[PDB]
Design an enzyme around this catalytic site. Sequence first.
Site, mmCIF file in Angstrom:
data_model
loop_
_atom_site.group_PDB
_atom_site.id
_atom_site.type_symbol
_atom_site.label_atom_id
_atom_site.label_comp_id
_atom_site.label_asym_id
_atom_site.label_seq_id
_atom_site.Cartn_x
_atom_site.Cartn_y
_atom_site.Cartn_z
ATOM 1 N N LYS C 201 -50.551 73.631 -67.044
ATOM 2 C CA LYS C 201 -51.973 73.567 -67.261
ATOM 3 C C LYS C 201 -52.880 73.640 -66.050
ATOM 4 O O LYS C 201 -52.847 72.594 -65.416
ATOM 5 C CB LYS C 201 -52.512 72.856 -68.497
ATOM 6 C CG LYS C 201 -53.976 73.151 -68.775
ATOM 7 C CD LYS C 201 -54.398 72.283 -69.933
ATOM 8 C CE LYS C 201 -55.861 72.566 -70.307
ATOM 9 N NZ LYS C 201 -56.299 71.682 -71.468
ATOM 10 N N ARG C 211 -65.473 75.668 -73.726
ATOM 11 C CA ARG C 211 -66.357 74.522 -73.685
ATOM 12 C C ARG C 211 -67.617 74.786 -74.520
ATOM 13 O O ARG C 211 -68.162 73.872 -75.151
ATOM 14 C CB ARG C 211 -66.658 74.172 -72.243
ATOM 15 C CG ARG C 211 -65.394 73.744 -71.525
ATOM 16 C CD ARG C 211 -65.500 73.753 -70.029
ATOM 17 N NE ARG C 211 -64.253 73.320 -69.405
ATOM 18 C CZ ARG C 211 -63.960 73.515 -68.130
ATOM 19 N NH1 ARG C 211 -64.822 74.142 -67.344
ATOM 20 N NH2 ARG C 211 -62.805 73.086 -67.639
ATOM 21 N N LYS C 217 -61.298 68.038 -62.931
ATOM 22 C CA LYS C 217 -60.101 68.540 -63.584
ATOM 23 C C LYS C 217 -58.940 68.559 -62.598
ATOM 24 O O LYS C 217 -57.778 68.404 -62.973
ATOM 25 C CB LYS C 217 -60.351 69.970 -64.066
ATOM 26 C CG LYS C 217 -61.513 70.111 -65.044
ATOM 27 C CD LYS C 217 -61.144 69.570 -66.409
ATOM 28 C CE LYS C 217 -62.316 69.614 -67.370
ATOM 29 N NZ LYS C 217 -61.900 69.167 -68.729
ATOM 30 N N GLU C 233 -43.162 70.413 -63.613
ATOM 31 C CA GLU C 233 -43.936 69.962 -64.772
ATOM 32 C C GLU C 233 -43.197 70.266 -66.064
ATOM 33 O O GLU C 233 -43.086 69.410 -66.947
ATOM 34 C CB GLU C 233 -45.302 70.648 -64.797
ATOM 35 C CG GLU C 233 -46.334 70.024 -63.877
ATOM 36 C CD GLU C 233 -46.812 68.678 -64.370
ATOM 37 O OE1 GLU C 233 -46.485 68.323 -65.518
ATOM 38 O OE2 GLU C 233 -47.502 67.988 -63.599
ATOM 39 N N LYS C 248 -50.716 77.765 -69.259
ATOM 40 C CA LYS C 248 -52.133 77.687 -69.455
ATOM 41 C C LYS C 248 -53.007 77.853 -68.243
ATOM 42 O O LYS C 248 -52.892 76.898 -67.496
ATOM 43 C CB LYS C 248 -52.644 76.864 -70.620
ATOM 44 C CG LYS C 248 -54.153 76.915 -70.790
ATOM 45 C CD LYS C 248 -54.488 75.911 -71.860
ATOM 46 C CE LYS C 248 -56.009 75.855 -72.072
ATOM 47 N NZ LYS C 248 -56.336 74.968 -73.255
ATOM 48 N N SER C 274 -59.995 81.381 -73.598
ATOM 49 C CA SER C 274 -61.334 81.825 -73.947
ATOM 50 C C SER C 274 -61.922 82.795 -72.926
ATOM 51 O O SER C 274 -62.476 83.835 -73.292
ATOM 52 C CB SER C 274 -62.233 80.593 -74.099
ATOM 53 O OG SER C 274 -62.264 79.818 -72.919
ATOM 54 N N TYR C 312 -57.124 84.532 -79.115
ATOM 55 C CA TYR C 312 -58.264 84.720 -80.024
ATOM 56 C C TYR C 312 -58.295 86.153 -80.601
ATOM 57 O O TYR C 312 -59.054 86.441 -81.548
ATOM 58 C CB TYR C 312 -59.568 84.355 -79.303
ATOM 59 C CG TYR C 312 -59.562 82.945 -78.764
ATOM 60 C CD1 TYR C 312 -59.855 81.852 -79.593
ATOM 61 C CD2 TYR C 312 -59.228 82.693 -77.439
ATOM 62 C CE1 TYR C 312 -59.828 80.564 -79.110
ATOM 63 C CE2 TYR C 312 -59.202 81.393 -76.940
ATOM 64 C CZ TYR C 312 -59.483 80.332 -77.789
ATOM 65 O OH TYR C 312 -59.434 79.045 -77.307
#
Lengths: 323, 329, 323, 329, 323, 329
Positions: C201, C211, C217, C233, C248, C274, C312
Amino acid sequence: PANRAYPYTRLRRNRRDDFSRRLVRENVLTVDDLILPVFVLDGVNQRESIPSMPGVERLSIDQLLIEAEEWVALGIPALALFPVTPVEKKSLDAAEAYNPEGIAQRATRALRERFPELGIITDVALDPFTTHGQNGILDDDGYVLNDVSIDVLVRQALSHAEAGAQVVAPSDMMDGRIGAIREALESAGHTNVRVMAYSAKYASAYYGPFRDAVGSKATYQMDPANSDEALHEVAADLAEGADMVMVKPGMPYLDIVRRVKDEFRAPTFVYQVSGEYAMHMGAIQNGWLAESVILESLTAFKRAGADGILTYFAKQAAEQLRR
Amino acid sequence: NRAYPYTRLRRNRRDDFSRRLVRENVLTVDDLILPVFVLDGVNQRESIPSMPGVERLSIDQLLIEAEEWVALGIPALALFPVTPVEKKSLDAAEAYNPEGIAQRATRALRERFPELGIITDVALDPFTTHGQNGILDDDGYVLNDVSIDVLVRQALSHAEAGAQVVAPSDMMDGRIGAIREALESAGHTNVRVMAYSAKYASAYYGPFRDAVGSASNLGKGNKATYQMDPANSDEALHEVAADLAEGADMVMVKPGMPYLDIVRRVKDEFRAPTFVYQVSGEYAMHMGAIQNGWLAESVILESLTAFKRAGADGILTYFAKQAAEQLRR
Amino acid sequence: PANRAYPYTRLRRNRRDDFSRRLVRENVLTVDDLILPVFVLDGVNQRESIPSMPGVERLSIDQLLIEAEEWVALGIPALALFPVTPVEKKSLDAAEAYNPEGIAQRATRALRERFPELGIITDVALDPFTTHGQNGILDDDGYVLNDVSIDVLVRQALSHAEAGAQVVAPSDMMDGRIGAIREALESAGHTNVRVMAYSAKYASAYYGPFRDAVGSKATYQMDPANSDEALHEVAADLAEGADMVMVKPGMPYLDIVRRVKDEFRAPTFVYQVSGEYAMHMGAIQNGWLAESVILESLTAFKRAGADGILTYFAKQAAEQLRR
Amino acid sequence: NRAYPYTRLRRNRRDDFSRRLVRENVLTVDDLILPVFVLDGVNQRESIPSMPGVERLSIDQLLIEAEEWVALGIPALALFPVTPVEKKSLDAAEAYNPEGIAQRATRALRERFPELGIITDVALDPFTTHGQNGILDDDGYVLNDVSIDVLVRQALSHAEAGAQVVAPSDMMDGRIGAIREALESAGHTNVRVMAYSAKYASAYYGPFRDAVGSASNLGKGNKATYQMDPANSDEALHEVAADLAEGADMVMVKPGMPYLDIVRRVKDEFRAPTFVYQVSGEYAMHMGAIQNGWLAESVILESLTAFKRAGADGILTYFAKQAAEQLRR
Amino acid sequence: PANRAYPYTRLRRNRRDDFSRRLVRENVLTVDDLILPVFVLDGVNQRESIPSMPGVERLSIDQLLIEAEEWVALGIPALALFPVTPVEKKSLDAAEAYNPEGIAQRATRALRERFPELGIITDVALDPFTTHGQNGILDDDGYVLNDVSIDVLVRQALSHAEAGAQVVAPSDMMDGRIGAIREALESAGHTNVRVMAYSAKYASAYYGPFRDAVGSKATYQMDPANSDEALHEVAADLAEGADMVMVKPGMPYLDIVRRVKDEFRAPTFVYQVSGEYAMHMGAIQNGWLAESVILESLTAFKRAGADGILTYFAKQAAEQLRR
Amino acid sequence: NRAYPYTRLRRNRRDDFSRRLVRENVLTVDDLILPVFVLDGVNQRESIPSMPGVERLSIDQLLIEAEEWVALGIPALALFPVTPVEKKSLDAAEAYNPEGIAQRATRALRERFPELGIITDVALDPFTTHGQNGILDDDGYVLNDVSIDVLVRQALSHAEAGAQVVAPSDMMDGRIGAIREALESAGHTNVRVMAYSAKYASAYYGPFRDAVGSASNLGKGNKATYQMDPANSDEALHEVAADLAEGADMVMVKPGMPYLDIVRRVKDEFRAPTFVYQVSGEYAMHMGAIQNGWLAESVILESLTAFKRAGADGILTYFAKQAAEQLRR
Ligand SMILES: O=C(O)CCC(=O)CF
Ligand SMILES: O=C(O)CCC(=O)CF
Ligand SMILES: O=C(O)CCC(=O)CF
Ligand SMILES: [K+]
Ligand SMILES: [K+]
Ligand SMILES: [K+]
Ligand SMILES: [K+]
Ligand SMILES: [K+]
Ligand SMILES: [K+]
Ligand SMILES: [Mg+2]
Ligand SMILES: [Mg+2]
Ligand SMILES: [Mg+2]
Ligand SMILES: [Mg+2]
Ligand SMILES: [Mg+2]
Ligand SMILES: [Mg+2]
Ligand code: NA
Ligand code: NA
Ligand code: NA
Ligand code: NA
Ligand code: NA
Ligand code: NA
């Protein structure tokens, strides 16, 4: 190989011009790779020169704060603190180590308050606090007791976290000490305090000048002949929770840095020790070697796989990188 | 081994200083190559609608802008001539014209900025009436070896003009060896060959085709008989192996972001100087989104950092000036 | 190499004809690789356009059910639900997260009943439910508390399983959260609920438009410069019981997808976020890029090693694959 | 690492949707090559008892059936001529007859279905009185280099007939290089060579020998001096390495199912386009069992999926039409 | 490669003569590689032919003892027993499975007494004992309950050890069943009873004829498309204590055998299943394939890495090897 | 992973049946090559004191004993001539004498036992007055290339005599390629070359020197300028790589037991047909101990099994007959 052969392949082509040398350049040293070790005195308004480390000064905390202003302005990400314990604070109790008003603890608080973004790496060890120069509540035979030595290192580590240190670094080479401190830090709520393990720590002659600096091995520090052994040492520290692992000394062990990074792909650090600094600085001052060897020596660490380098040349290097 | 909570990976992320210490890759200006579209004539500057912020420039204007690029430390430019329509032909002869745009631009830049790297484009797409990267047979197929003959002449003309690097973007089989032989025989010992090794038949080249003016010539034509199938990864390794054997000094993967896995495999397998072209479509996508306020400008450096992380030594990117400016801060 | 050399070897031979290109084609995208993320509104008979995600709509549950009819007919194996929490349900309690009548829970029940074979992947995170946009019952300093954040994620995860979700996906990047949910699911009898870990991530600029979609972050999301770290990870998440692991953002991290699949040979997923969608869709609408880049971008994920792609573009892609 | 019950591998198996998401390999029509037995004459169709469902076809009938194969998306056919007995000889001259069945069939198919791949068989077994894949010396040994000379002539005749791919199934040492040289010298630049690289001396070829009519010629004869010993795996890698060095565009492992381990090793070691022939005996075994009601028809796709999982890019299989039909659903 | 090139290298040289083919021959099948599965009837003096397995007979125990005399004389090291449960012993209790007088238990005792050196591998599974043909005390939904199914398998396993079986083989594909039986065997004192795990067990069409033989999947047996998954399955079984691991079916999965042996270097077994036997035997009887395919098929398993092969051709193969 | 007591490695060891099932390697007669010392003359048999149980044999006696070796299934013999003292010379001409012992023995065996493999020794040590494996210069150094010239003549004479395999045991650089070229040029297409690739300067050759009669000639002389330093392992890989590139069909490691690590590395690195010579000293050591009652006879098969476990495909061993006899039971 890829069947590359002269003269179809001439490796000098990329070397022909600066622009192509820059394009293919495999590694670059930056200020983000530098950690500066500092020798910290008790008292106020004091500095002392170290005969075997030309150019390096022991600094009282007020003086440390003055010099840190520039270290920070230069972008140096972290300092490694080494207190110079007054002989009268030494002992057996070996409890200046966890003393909240001890030099390391005082220096840490002071720096954390004044330079909140600067990393502070404290030294978890007992010898600077033993009248007998031994990293342990030693045995009656003179063997550095392992588990009992670890007991001490824990309260000291907690005291450093309590003082605000973001990283504690057991420089001791006792078996299984990483796990013990990790557990203690976790149990106490110090969730994000990092542990930088001195993982592959050799019994070396290169530490000479450091002993001069702080005013202070084969049964705990590694045999310089051994390489495979270094991998087992690092593996154990990673399993025990170390966030970063270190190879100690540096340049004489570049092969170990390479093997460690290749094998574990973990944050890997290397100490360019006092003896390495002194031999370079002496040669430069004698007019035997150009100043450029400083960056050459540091570039070697990056090329070998190091993520960070503890080096007494950090300020000079950062100044050159800025230029 | 490492298990939570003895290992909390967030510890090194907690602070900027520790993030900096463990940071695995860093982008620097030494990694940037700026492609430039060059016009014929004098005092010409033309905006490219599908490449916002990018302009075609005549040589005199190119020389002026290069002053800033050089001041920023950008090590090299990659030149792409915008060939006048009337100079296009079946034989692509303009490709090796000593007075062609690429040749003239190279001579001008080599004289004005001797330390600046000039990478010329070895390919026939800008010079053919049909827009293919080589010469066509009677069935409309791009002939391999006959095309190489022209590419060799072109590469020699670039070397004569003073280019330090010729970059064959044609994807003919064996062209790296042919060009290398020719360079060696002619005494151009140190002219580097940056092979477009794993060059994919991609849709991300659209805006470039507009920039250079090959779009109208190519029409709906494709390059699937020479550019690589995007589905293929192992094939890329065979392409690079051949180009290294043939004498390439640098090997490139083409497009960039949509092929970072190939960059990674190529660097890992060959440990050779590896490039990666952030193509016109990649630039356009990012620029469009930034200008619409959909993505923060920070995405430029993130996109470029990806290339370094993936294993690239150098990046062809139309963001080179912007990146270099941001890096200087 | 195998000593392959021009002209004995001409790699263009297989490229000469469609039939031979098809025979040697190394990877193919199919509908079995597609997961469609959906933004879910509260209420009835509503749809909203998202300015920074042209073509994507926020959907009320009844509308979601209407669109799902076609998603299912197209063969799309699963949806990833992202509720658009009304500001009045937000808070501190951060308990709309485990609310049985919360949007995610309602949407899950509705879809599971109407389309029993369709996979539902729920989002385990607290930020859509925090008034302060933070994935944690945050500290008084603003640091996203790790273990306390995990406490919350567990009841939410159980609530999703209770609603019938076949997969829960902690999108949070808190250390050790996979094990905690796994244990909870096992202890509660939810033996076959899968855990799709957002393993690698990154702290990325590519999340901008998301968002905007959900109305929301570096200390928790990974530094984009780091690759080796991604392997550590993923290893941890697999050890903790994840059934699937995810990288990600996607295209800007294809090298990570490749390394993750190569290293662990585990079910590997990737999110075309996105920002990736928006930059492609914008270029296509501007007439700067052909529509074919959609399949090109998705094919890249398969080539890189991904088993599944959260995108998407899933409907549009499935339509093209059907054609 | 992964331990039960934190890890329950049955979770992803629980539902069709998750099984689909994690499914590692998929068979498509792009993976299929249909072998076909071709007769001389007109309006000829002959059933093969040991290959139920398979028929030998004259060229006119072949053209009719190909209409459906092409409609199904099958990318290529592999042609096997059924040589008339009177055309067999010691010198295998019919192998390079421009009017031989294979040559005539190739010309006919290339004209009728220009996009359909035609893979011809380079081998002398269909043309010799003794049924060996090469020419014999006075001791009954299949001469290597003398056989290559004939195979080269054959391959050239196939290229002249328009075949896009020639597939040497002979197992002579060095034949791939000889054929490649000859193709290059003659200007057949793009004719692919699909090498039967790791070709085993197997008992699974029985039904094929019947189909093509080499059975009576071969009698009890063997091919252990050229086809590989089934016990050998490392040897397969040396065979493939040589064929790649010699210029093969594709390499094949032969038989299929009984050699999936070889397919796996070959793909892993070389990362080259890898095939695998599901031979006549494999087809017959499966068909017999299906027709007896011992195995469900589903076994066809399971057998073919195995090849993809093992690493094959393409599969020669007499089930290609059935598979393609099932895949279309 | 080693730059081997024609004509310096002619791979046909070693193939020229039998003697050189023998010298370089990489693998050889021997009787030490063969395990013979046997279908065991209740009752006395009975044999039954199986329509879909030509040549294979179901045998009452007295008949089994008669045939075993020759199996042993031929050197076959072990048998795998599969009882043919009378419908009246079937059920829910699913307790003919651990019945001390059940066929498997009776057959084991009989063979162990008469042929002490012959290995007996029993089948740990419940389906031959379920009226519903399900390897579990199933759920009310028809899902094969995992952990509850494991409960049953344990007493059955202990009953086999109690009967003298040297090897128990859970043929079930339930998660974590190896550990459970291992623990039970250890806790009970059955220290040297081996566990042969059916580790990579595919949902296959090749099992058809076996169902005919015994008179009897995607949610527990593996997807034939998956290879990496097989490695994870085997790893888990080895970690859980399996002494031997098996790939199931055989020839259609030779690539898996190869990967499993290469990855773990553990005792690796393979089942040439009923469907494989039947398709070969049918072709041989039809006069479509020579008998030599039997040894060819078995040699493939050795070449692929198998240490042992469960095969219905074991007797015929052993006879040929003897010859 | 595997931890006690979930894993008890003794379980598979508990019984013979499970030990057999998991047994990783097995020695068979197909792995054995018998070296034989051949005398001139008729009806000659001579015991070798340092090699108990081994006899030198004239050709007629060799033919008689071979009857049993062949009946036992031993695939090949390796011939070592016992050169008469008067036939030794500076030029080693007897090495290529068509009427030399090795040549005569080969012709006799090839006629009598056509299926038996005959491996001849290519080396000059049996033919020189000084006992070195090549020709000496004026400084007493074994000249590389000049020696190869003689070895080539020798190898050709062996091929002419009918040997299926020539085995250069000389350790000259490049001799495998020279011999292969010569064999190919002369039409000896299928004559195998078994290279002594990683041949060590060992003390374990003593008894052989006695057996063949080179001991008196060699005296205290050494071979450190051509045979390998026993300390060296990596060097062995370079030796084998070269011999494979040069055309060897088989590569050998020499001595055996004291070099099993080399056998293992060689098989692992190259995956080629790998041999290993259990030398005279190894045989003598074992035989002496067995005859003294210090070691059980079982040690013979244990020693031979080691070679298979280490990765050898074939073993040269003076125990071949004994082993084959034991294996037949
Ligand atoms: O001076 C030395 O011996 C090394 C320094 C340490 O070991 C610190 F605890
Ligand atoms: O919007 C972001 O920052 C990423 C989304 C998450 O992190 C979800 F819990
Ligand atoms: O018949 C089957 O489905 C396979 C046999 C088993 O699974 C045994 F427990
Ligand atoms: K660079
Ligand atoms: K750093
Ligand atoms: K394919
Ligand atoms: K998938
Ligand atoms: K052998
Ligand atoms: K065995
Ligand atoms: Mg240690
Ligand atoms: Mg190329
Ligand atoms: Mg994590
Ligand atoms: Mg070959
Ligand atoms: Mg399992
Ligand atoms: Mg040599
Ligand atoms: Na210290
Ligand atoms: Na171009
Ligand atoms: Na989220
Ligand atoms: Na053939
Ligand atoms: Na079963
Ligand atoms: Na010799």
